[PDB]
Ligand binder design. Structure first.
Ligand SMILES: N[C@@H](CCC(=O)N[C@@H](CS)C(=O)NCC(=O)O)C(=O)O
Ligand SMILES: N[C@@H](CCC(=O)N[C@@H](CS)C(=O)NCC(=O)O)C(=O)O
Ligand SMILES: CC/C=C\C[C@H]1C(=O)CC[C@@H]1CC(=O)O
Ligand SMILES: CC(C)[C@H](N)C(=O)O
Lengths: 569, 214, 214
């Protein structure tokens, strides 16, 4: 049960208990994982009394390539347990690419606890620095509308999808968040771009008591406010008549807005008279809700440059930076949120994994062995490796971090980082240039609509006969099917290579399916990734999916705003 | 050659065949008639007159957990069912007994009963299954890094999961795919692919036991 | 220092106490009010909430017989309860399983229930002490050539023997004497001579149980 004082002293002494709680967490994590096959190959069995000694010296470090096949084996029909155990209720992805191919990572309810618990903390540190009204609300440009089911009939998914429509989300987050503006249905609307429009509308809807605006990223915010920036005339109009704009087409969520809507003409006179007086929407975030205590989101790392256009949006309202973690395992919390983005740092939370760091201290990179969590050196930069519930054991994620200080016995981390980049070559291509060019080629059919294409992804589906690739799309606004059908044709018509020509014309691999997805989708793979436990090197999104990709995949099926198989061919 | 006195739908019998075959032991399997129990079973077990019982070295060993521990103990040079440490063989025993008692009663009222106990037992089954998923946390197996003691204890209950999905009428896969997929993880191995009889037939005999007594 | 969670008339708590004291541990006993099950027990077994619980390295060891082999394996150098062969281990374990089923329940019937339930339990325990008597055969103990595993398992019932004799208004000795006879033999071991409370009191707790539920 959420309270302020008693949770934080537990945590103060948790943060000072740093070493036993992880060694325990490790020995928990071993005792819950004594049956793991890679460990049999490693030589492990249980308690010992050199266990941490046995661990770092007997079990080798591992990469995405080597990890792909194991968690791949988990997912495809062989529902079978491998580097974790329990075929997990979900699988995740990692930004960057496994020699360029997708990687898989197990998800257990443990992660959901991880999410909730560190947030139970997190809301408590911020509400300490920005105390909140117990009968208000928050504007959440948040989504979890999507759920695919894997080739094995096994669920594999994002932190998003897994947290919000998890059976424990509602009861658990109810006491640590101001009630969401959006009914969950529009959150899990099969159209999250029409849901956005409604999401921004939703937070716009209960503003006076709104305590903050939020997105994981301030680009979730500036893109939401660039979305906002694209849609509020129509917002006056759809809201004014008590009849929603014909832009929205999804009937379950249209039902959700209709249960909400009635005709009200004065009110528009007003909105139009406020947001004008500004010089172009400086400090809009306090314009919308003059009473938001803050703008919450990650504001370090790969994207320092949109804290200013968000500061621009947020004005003089404080801009507060978000804690770090992922599906791969959570790391570090800002228990002093009042700190500025550029100087913002975050302290590790103890039983979410057992952590280790490889030093960069020599030249580049450095052949020295990892040291312990309380053994890390202040001011110096190390790369994090991760041992946790998410099937990762001393796993090298590949990201370099700076140590800035200690909150009591626990360290505070910094991320000056961006891309976890060295690559290698693959088989999800159809040269990245070809696939980018595919999107580019087909998407200008949408550009006829004053539209650009914000991002894209794909998927190889070999359960179906024949198998088909699935191209994925984030666009800036709604449109009709005919042009999207056309578009799918052009993606087929744009991979320019001689090869898959034999393929699809022979249809030995069946027609490309373009499932167009709604806004925020690739924003959420992003929002997943900077928060991810490592360093800010987390932004090169994998572009086409082998069966071994997960974060973009749960996202793909349920927010089929439309899905089509090519009529040509 | 060791002699197994067993019962083809007996899960505990399935424990013994899984264990002995999990090693590298060639043994002879004998079908028991519980109306006409062999002179071998009555001279091996004059008291409970129960299966499974394996005769090795001219010596009958009875009880499933007891036969299986007997297997680990007599031939311990390749694939140990136990981890090296006292407390961890203790945590295979703790969960062996769990699968064996509260879990096996719950499941027994699943396939053996009508009405109240059937339902409240469906609960129990959803509850005990709920705990075993929890402590396993994330283990592909159970008793050690490979095929274990408590996993052989429960894997035999894979060939009844399907009976339990018709009479208990749940899908523990869609509320915990974790567990049956240990079971199908474990089914890629030959001790389970040729010891546990066909899933359909267990359903047949479970329903037919239901036919014979009211 | 080993912390045991115990209950003065727990035949099972006695299984733990006799086991440990038989081995050579100095340990601490804490008496339970099962109306208020302790913070560290409710952490040891948050569902069964049942004893005996021996705590070592801060790891709770639970269930009586589980706890006594825990005893064997925790200090494997001086006093083994099993003999060296896997067979003998299986027989001792076999017979420990015997003590735990029809035997425990039947005693439970003789002091805990009456009438139609009672005599069922009475013929059941005389039958039990008879198969027992048959397998004791001659040996000073049970589970080896000396003080054994199951010696611990069933010796702890011999202070309840008084309550069985009185509510049963029986005498379990003229029908099977070598058993009680073996028991006051086994009383000479300092493991049971100091771990087991007085029988007039145990009788009296059976009397409190009976007086409550008539
Ligand atoms: N708990 C013992 C007893 C087993 C038991 O009762 N098994 C059933 C078949 S699985 C049986 O043999 N029943 C004998 C009968 O019907 O009398 C064991 O697991 O071996
Ligand atoms: N199978 C048990 C037998 C123990 C037993 O019956 N314990 C009783 C002692 S009276 C108990 O602790 N009951 C717990 C309760 O009902 O609160 C073991 O050996 O641990
Ligand atoms: C902990 C709650 C789970 C959801 C996490 C997401 C948010 O609510 C904002 C980001 C956070 C992920 C991150 O910190 O990486
Ligand atoms: C949204 C949150 C749960 C997560 N970081 C994601 O984007 O997947």
């Amino acid at each position: 049960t959420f309270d302020m004082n008693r949770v934080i002293d537990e945590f103060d002494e948790m943060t000072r208990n740093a070493h036993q709680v992880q060694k325990q967490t490790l020995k928990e994590i071993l005792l819950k994982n004594q049956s793991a096959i890679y460990l049999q190959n490693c030589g492990l069995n249980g308690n010992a009394t050199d266990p941490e000694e046995a661990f770092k010296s007997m079990v080798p470090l591992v990469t995405d390539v080597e990890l792909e096949p194991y968690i791949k084996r988990m997912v495809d029909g062989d529902t079978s347990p491998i580097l974790t155990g329990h075929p997990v209720p979900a699988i995740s992805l990692s930004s960057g690419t496994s020699q360029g191919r997708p990687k898989f990572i197990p998800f257990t309810d443990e992660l959901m606890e991880n999410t909730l618990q560190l947030f139970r903390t997190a809301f408590a540190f911020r509400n300490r620095d920005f105390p909140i009204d117990d009968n208000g609300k928050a504007l959440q440009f948040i989504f979890s509308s999507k759920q695919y089911i894997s080739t094995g009939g096994v669920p594999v998914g994002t932190a998003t999808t897994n947290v919000y429509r998890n059976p424990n989300f509602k009861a658990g987050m109810k006491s640590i968040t101001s009630p969401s503006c959006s009914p969950d249905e529009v959150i899990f609307s099969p159209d999250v771009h029409q849901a956005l429009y409604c999401h921004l509308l939703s937070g716009i809807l209960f503003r006076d008591q709104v305590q903050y605006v939020f997105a994981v990223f301030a680009h979730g915010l500036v893109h939401a406010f660039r979305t906002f920036e694209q849609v509020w005339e129509e917002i006056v109009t759809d809201i004014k008549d008590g009849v929603l704009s014909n832009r929205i087409t999804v009937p379950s969520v249209r039902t959700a807005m209709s249960k909400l809507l009635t005709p009200n003409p004065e009110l528009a006179e007003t909105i139009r008279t406020k947001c004008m007086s500004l010089s172009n929407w400086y400090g809009l975030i306090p314009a919308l809700f003059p009473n938001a205590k803050y703008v919450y989101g990650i504001m370090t790392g790969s994207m320092e440059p949109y804290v200013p256009k968000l500061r621009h949006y947020a004005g003089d309202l404080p801009l507060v930076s978000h804690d770090y973690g992922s599906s791969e395992g959570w790391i570090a919390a800002n228990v002093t949120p009042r700190l500025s983005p550029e100087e913002a740092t975050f302290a590790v939370i103890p039983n979410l994994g057992y952590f280790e760091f490889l030093p960069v201290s020599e030249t580049g990179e450095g052949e020295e062995k990892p040291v312990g969590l309380t053994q890390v050196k202040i001011g110096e930069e190390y790369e994090v490796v991760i041992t946790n519930y998410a099937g990762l054991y001393r796993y090298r994620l590949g990201d370099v971090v700076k140590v800035i200080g200690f909150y009591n016995n626990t360290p505070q981390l910094k991320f000056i980082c961006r891309r976890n980049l060295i690559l290698s070559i693959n088989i999800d291509k159809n040269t990245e240039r070809d696939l980018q060019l595919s999107v580019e080629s087909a998407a200008k059919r949408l550009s006829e609509e004053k539209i650009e294409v914000i991002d894209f992804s794909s998927y190889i589906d070999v359960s179906t006969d024949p198998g088909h690739y699935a191209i994925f799309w984030e666009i800036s606004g709604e449109t009709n099917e005919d042009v999207l059908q056309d578009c799918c044709n052009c993606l087929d018509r744009a991979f320019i290579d001689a090869g898959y020509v034999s393929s699809r014309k022979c249809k030995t691999i069946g027609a490309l399916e373009l499932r167009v997805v709604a806004k925020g989708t690739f924003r959420k793979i992003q929002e997943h990734f900077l928060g991810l436990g490592s360093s800010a090197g987390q932004f090169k999104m994998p572009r086409c999916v082998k069966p071994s990709n997960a974060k973009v995949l749960q996202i793909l099926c349920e927010n089929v705003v439309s899905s089509y198989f090519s009529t040509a061919f | 050659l060791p002699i197994l006195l067993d019962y083809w739908p007996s899960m505990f019998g399935m424990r013994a065949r899984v264990a002995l075959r999990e090693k590298g032991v060639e043994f002879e399997y004998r079908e028991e008639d519980f109306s006409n129990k062999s002179p071998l079973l009555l001279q091996s077990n004059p008291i409970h007159k129960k299966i499974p019982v394996l005769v090795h070295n001219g010596k009958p060993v009875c009880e499933s957990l007891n036969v299986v521990q007997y297997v680990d103990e007599a031939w311990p040079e390749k694939n140990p069912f136990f981890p090296s440490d006292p407390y961890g063989r203790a945590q295979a025993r703790f969960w062996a007994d769990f699968v064996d008692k509260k879990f096996t009663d719950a499941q027994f009222k699943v396939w053996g009963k009508k009405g109240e106990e059937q339902e409240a037992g469906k609960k129990e089954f959803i509850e005990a299954v709920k705990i075993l998923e929890s402590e396993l946390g994330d283990k592909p197996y159970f008793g050690g890094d490979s095929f274990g003691y408590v996993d052989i204890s429960l894997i035999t209950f894979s060939s009844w999961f399907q009976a339990y999905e018709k009479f208990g009428n749940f899908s523990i896969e869609s509320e915990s795919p974790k567990l049956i997929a240990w079971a199908k993880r474990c089914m890629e191995k030959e001790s389970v692919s040729k010891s546990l009889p066909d899933s359909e037939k267990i359903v047949a005999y479970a329903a037919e036991y239901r036919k014979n007594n009211l």
